[PDB]
Amino acid sequence: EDGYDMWLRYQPIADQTLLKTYQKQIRHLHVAGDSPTINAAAAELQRGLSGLLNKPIVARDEKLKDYSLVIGTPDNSPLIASLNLGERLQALGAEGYLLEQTRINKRHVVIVAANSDVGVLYGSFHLLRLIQTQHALEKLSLSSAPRLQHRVVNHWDNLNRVVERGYAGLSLWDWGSLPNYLAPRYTDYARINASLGINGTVINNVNADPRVLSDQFLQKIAALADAFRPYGIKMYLSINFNSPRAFGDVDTADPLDPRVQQWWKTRAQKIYSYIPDFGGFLVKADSEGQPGPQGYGRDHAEGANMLAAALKPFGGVVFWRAFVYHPDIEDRFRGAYDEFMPLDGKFADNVILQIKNGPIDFQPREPFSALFAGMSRTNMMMEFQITQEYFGFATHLAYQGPLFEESLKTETHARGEGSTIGNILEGKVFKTRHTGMAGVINPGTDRNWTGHPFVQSSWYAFGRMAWDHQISAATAADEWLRMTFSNQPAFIEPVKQMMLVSREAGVNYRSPLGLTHLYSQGDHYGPAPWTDDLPRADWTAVYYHRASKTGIGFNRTKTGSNALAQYPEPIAKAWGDLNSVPEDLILWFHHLSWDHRMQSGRNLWQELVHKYYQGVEQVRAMQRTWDQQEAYVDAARFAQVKALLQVQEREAVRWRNSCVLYFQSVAGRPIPANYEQPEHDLEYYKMLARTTYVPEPWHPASSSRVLK
């Protein structure tokens, strides 16, 4: 087990009684269709069933035999059409499917039925998942359809093949051998994402390189698109707003200039000539120095709509990122809301605003982005981060399912009760045209795709939740563990709980209680809560915590920045009252004296210390849990995870000691005697922050030769 297969491990079912049952139920594989997508489904079922059932199962188009798996749509499988499934099937739409044990012409069968070929593919992966997770097929009758339209992954890959916030190797795309070399890995990438129902990929960095729109690169990108197409995955590209200038074709990129409009129209025509079902563009504009419409005195709708107009005749969409914050504002938290609310309704119907889960930047816990509850006339989609920019690169274990679930199940009160983030995304709150979620996965050429084996679980949960936003982190973890490691109950339960606590542990010894942005800048590996004096205050740590001898926290109530007024009234009320604000968010909204007593009875200083130390204890407990699983996991992955957990524990201690000693230096209060005193002093950990290796190829910090 080297992780290359991820969760698509088709090894013989270990429970011999269950294996025999599956062997009796699925003796043949019947596939009448022959489109590329049906062929991909058939190939997946052949390899998967053959492996899981430990016998040769070959897809055939032959007279139906007793005890067959029969797959297809009414349009390509006369057997399926003969069942007259009618409305029940039709209601599942263009990507849904029905899995059902039934009879056809007196033969015992299990069907994978859908309206479209991609629905057959998705259903086929679910059928395999049922076997992989040891679910019974007897009396099976289950249907499913995705709850979001655009279920996409994002890769922050540079064309040099270095990945920005990439902890899993070089970019998968081997530009030097494209288009000529159609690497098997491109197909395996497509299988991985299609197994989750992911139907789009943005393959290139949002800090966008204009070369992707050149013929040289489009020929390469078209080869990738061709590999992805049978698996239902559309190609998207991040674009550079200044491309007309970069190509030397126009002396401006102003979206109101007719020459610019024409440049993008012509470029779209070129793209669609290479990739006829091209998805569209992802855009990071006017953010962190990236070009945009504001560079020409125009607004984000004028810019987005210009691009959207170019893509509309071809059916493309524009994912326009709302991650924008100008140096000039008083509270970064308020930025996106204040920038985009005036434009609600001004975007074209093929523009979708892509908004991060929170208003800052993927911090271990953030309150929900206010835009989701405010924009009632604009298409929106969520952006989540899987790659562990803020959760420890490839060395810490941090299953992200609980972060995604927490977000999706958050009640916003946008139009009263029931206005959860997931319901908003689905279109059940505000009537909308385009729905979706994007996940920043940043895998690479490492054998196991993700570096840390458990980052696979985060990618898994993302895709499952993009399909059904009400799926819990626990449900996704149970599935992933069974598919990836073992179906043994004694293994599943403790490792599932280990996964479920890992997100909170990462919060606890980095920045609990609503603290945030305490990372070393800009590499983000280790602690630096003392960070100050950067060219912009909102890039520092002190800006956010505002720690002093008297207290800590950032006042965003009516008496401070009043960011709470950007939320619906029930949220503003709940979060603005000390009696109701959740402690896990409190310092986002309140500057509190250190003597404030928390629910536990500890004062705020004591609680801060308690949480930091709790995070380390949680890591140690994870180590003990993992050691107890040796009998159930292959030796190689066992050893790898064990080692990584040791690194994590060392780094968690460094985080805890650095932050506690730093906040102590400001508050001037003792660490209670029942907590182990840090091994060294504050200056020592400032030295460690300057000298501890940063394990990422992209960020310049990994090249830093500082030794003191």
| Catalytic status, residue 328 | no
The distance of closest approach from Cβ of residue 413 to its own copies in the complex, given in angstroms and rounded to an integer, is 43
Under DSSP, the state recorded for 31 is E
Nearer to its own copies, 175 or 632 (CB): 175
Assign residue 567 a region (left: φ > 0; alpha: ψ between -120 and 50; beta: otherwise): beta
Torsion of CA 515, 383, 614, 667, to 10 degrees: -10
Site string for Co ion, 658-697 (x = CB under 5 A): -----------x----------------------------
Binding-site partner at residue 644 among Co ion, its own copies, none, CB < 5 to 8 Å by type: its own copies
- The interface partner of residue 498, options being Co ion, its own copies, none and the CB cut-off 5 to 8 Å by kind, is Co ion
CB-neighbour burial class of residue 41 (10 A; exposed 0-12, middle 13-18, buried 19+): buried
Cβ neighbors of 505 (< 8 A, separation 6 or more) are: 398, 615, 618, 619, 622, 652
What does 621 bind: Co ion, its own copies, none (CB cut-off 5 to 8 Å by kind)?
Co ion
Quote the least distance from Cβ 617 to Co ion, whole Å: 10
What is the binding site for its own copies (CB under 8 A)? 158-162, 169-170, 174-177, 180-184, 209-211, 214, 216-217, 246-248, 393-395, 445-447, 636, 639-640, 643-644, 646-647, 691-693, 695-697, 702-703, 705, 707-708
Query: Which of residues 181 and 679 has its CB atom nearest to its own copies in the complex?
Result: 181
| Options 158, 201, 385, 531; binder of Co ion; rule CB under 5 A | 158
Binding Co ion (rule: CB under 5 A), the pick from 7, 404, 567, 605 is 605
Count residues near Co ion (CB under 5 A): 11
By CB under 5 A, is residue 448 in contact with Co ion? Answer: yes
Q: Which residue is nearest to Co ion (CB)?
A: 3
Neighbours of 10 (CB within 10 A): 19
* Among 4, 694, 3, CA closest to 393: 694
406 classed as catalytic: no
Determine which residue in the list 3, 72, 232, 451 makes contact with Co ion, applying CB under 5 A.
Answer: 3
Stretch that binds Co ion, among 259-267, 446-454, 485-493, 542-550 (CB under 5 A): 446-454
Backbone angles phi, psi at 593, to 5 degrees: -70, 150
Judged by beta carbon distances under 5 to 8 A according to partner kind, the member of its own copies, Co ion, none in contact with residue 707 is its own copies
Q: Which amino acid is at 535?
A: P
Q: How far is the CB of 158 from its own copies (least distance, A)?
A: 7
Q: In the structure encoding, which two tokens stand for residue 74, read together?
A: 């009414």
Q: How far is the CB of 145 from its own copies (least distance, A)?
A: 37
Least distance in angstroms from the C-beta of 246 to Co ion: 18
Q: Closer to its own copies by CB, 9 or 433: give it.
A: 9
User: At its nearest, how many Å lie between its own copies and the CB of residue 164?
Assistant: 12
**Token pair 């960020």 in the structure block, residue:** 699
Pick the catalytic residue from 249, 302, 344, 361.
361
Shortest Å, Cβ 635 to its own copies: 10
Environment class of 176 (CB within 10 Å of its CB; exposed 0-12, middle 13-18, buried 19+):
exposed
Q: What is the DSSP letter of 161?
A: S
- Given Co ion, its own copies, none, residue 394, with its beta carbon under 5 to 8 Å by kind, binds its own copies
Closest distance between its own copies and the C-beta of residue 218, in Å?
13
Burial readout 392-415 (b: 16 or more C-beta within 10 A, e: otherwise): bbbbbbbbbbbbbbbbbebbbbbe
Cβ closest to its own copies, residue 70 vs residue 162: 162
Q: CA dihedral in degrees (82, 87, 90, 96; nearest 10)?
A: -100
Amino acid present at 174: D
Tokens representing 34 are: 């022959």
* Whole-angstrom distance, CA of residue 141 vs CA of residue 124: 14
Distance CA 176, CA 279 (A): 24
162 is an interface residue for Co ion by CB under 5 A = yes
**DSSP letter for each residue of 482-541:** HHHT---HHHHHHHHHHHHHHHHHHHHTT--TT----B-TTT-SSB-TT----SSGGGSS
Q: Say whether 426 is catalytic.
A: no
* From the list Co ion, its own copies, none, partner contacted by residue 669 (C-beta under 5 to 8 A by kind): Co ion
DSSP 440-456: E----SSTTSSSSTTHH
Closer CB to its own copies, 190 or 644, in the complex: 644
* Residue 605 binding: pick among Co ion, its own copies, none (C-beta 5-8 Å cut-off by kind): Co ion
Q: Does 495 bind Co ion (CB under 5 A)?
A: no
Cβ nearer to Co ion, comparing 225 with 622: 622
- Strand-pairing partners, residue 151, are 437
Nearer to Co ion, 205 or 511 (CB): 205
Residue 228 and residue 236: Cα distance in Å, rounded?
A: 11
**Paired strand residues for 98:** 113, 143
* Nearer to its own copies among residue 162 and residue 371 (C-beta): 162
Strands 234-239 and 28-31: unpaired
C-alpha torsion 496→653→512→529, nearest 10: -140
Q: Are the beta carbons of 440 and 156 closer than 8 angstroms?
A: yes
Report the C-alpha gap between 264 and 210 in whole angstroms: 13
- Do residues 417 and 425 make contact, with C-beta atoms less than 8 angstroms apart? no
Stretch in the footprint of Co ion (CB under 5 A) among 140-148, 539-547, 552-560, 601-609:
601-609
Cβ pair 260, 254 in contact under 8 A? yes
Q: Least CB distance from residue 248 to its own copies, whole Å?
A: 5
- The yes or no reply on residue 439 touching Co ion (CB under 5 A) is no
DSSP string, 381-415: EEEEE-S-TTTTTTTS----HHHHHHHHT-B--BT
Joined together, the tokens standing for residue 507 give 């919060």
Choose the catalytic residue: 66, 277, 288, 679.
288
Touching Co ion, residues 615-634 (CB under 5 A): 621-622, 625
Phi, psi of 581 (to 5 degrees): -65, 130
Indicate which single residue of 74, 169, 293, 453 sits in contact with Co ion (rule: CB under 5 A).
Answer: 453
Residue 316 contact, options Co ion, its own copies, none, Cβ 5-8 Å cut-off depending on partner type: none
Chosen from its own copies, Co ion, none, partner binding at 443 (C-beta under 5 to 8 Å by type):
none
Q: Which of 44, 164, 389, 607 is catalytic?
A: 389
We find the least distance from the C-beta atom of residue 380 to its own copies, in angstroms, to be: 32
CA distance 423 to 147: 9
Residue 622 binds which one of Co ion, its own copies, none, with CB within 5 to 8 A depending on kind? Co ion
CA distance 401 to 382: 15
Secondary structure of residue 207 in the 3-state scheme: coil
- Choose between 58 and 631: whose C-beta lies nearer to Co ion: 631
CB of 260 to its own copies, least distance (A): 17
What does 246 interact with, of its own copies, Co ion, none (CB < 5 to 8 A by kind)? Answer: its own copies
Instruction: Name which of 65 and 637 has its Cβ closer to its own copies.
Output: 637
CB of 171 to Co ion, least distance (A): 10
**Choice between 161 and 284, CB closer to its own copies:** 161
CA dist 440 and 465 (Å) reads 14
Closer of 64 and 246 to its own copies (Cβ) = 246
d(CA 173, CA 582): 44
Interaction partner, residue 175 (its own copies, Co ion, none; CB < 5-8 Å by kind): its own copies
With both helix axes pointing from N to C terminus, report the angle between 604-627 and 635-667 in degrees, rounded to the nearest 10.
170
Q: Catalog residues that contact Co ion under the rule CB under 5 A.
A: 3, 158, 162, 448, 453, 498, 605, 621-622, 625, 669
Q: Catalytic site residues?
A: 288, 361, 389
